[PDB]
A = this chain, B = another copy of it.
Amino acid sequence: SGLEDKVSKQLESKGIKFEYEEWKVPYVIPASNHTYTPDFLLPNGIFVKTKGLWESDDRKKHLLIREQHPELDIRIVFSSSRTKLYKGSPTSYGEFCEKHGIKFADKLIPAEWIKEPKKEVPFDRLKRK
């Protein structure tokens, strides 16, 4: 940076020795608690989240929830599952979903999802809004 160079030059002109970007200090960012609220809970126990833009942080959250709550059935309905992960990506939302086993559709909840046999929802593990 311009700032860094002015600081370096100043030290040098005064003959001050120094170590430059020589040492790393490790540290850990603690784990944090959050909540995610699906838009709909269907009678057969399927949760559905509707999404327009779907950012990288959202994708990550999705994977964490899946790994932490294998018993929940959370699906996504996209304005478009063809949108790319980002401006230059070759992969779309839908592709990401198929890669990670996330059930999804576009625009509306498919009639077949609604017909699936009921399954229990561990509400005790959830927090009512």
A interface with B by C-beta (< 8 Å):
1, 3-4, 6-8, 10-11, 14, 16-43, 47-48, 50-52, 61, 64-65, 68-69, 72, 74, 77, 79, 107-109, 111, 114, 123, 125-129
Could you tell me if B33 and A21 are in contact, using CB atoms closer than 8 angstroms?
Answer: no
Closest to A111 in B: B14
Q: Decide if the interface of chain A is mainly helix, strand, loop or mixed.
A: mixed
Could you tell me if B127 and A26 are in contact, using CB atoms closer than 8 angstroms?
Answer: yes
Task: Find chain B residues with CB under 8 A from A23 CB.
Answer: 37-38, 41, 47, 123, 126-129
Copies of this protein, total: 2
Residue among A17, A36, A50 with max Cβ neighbours from chain B (10 Å)? A50
Could you tell me if A27 and B34 are in contact, using CB atoms closer than 8 angstroms?
Answer: yes
Task: Find chain B residues with CB under 8 A from A1 CB.
Answer: 39, 50, 52
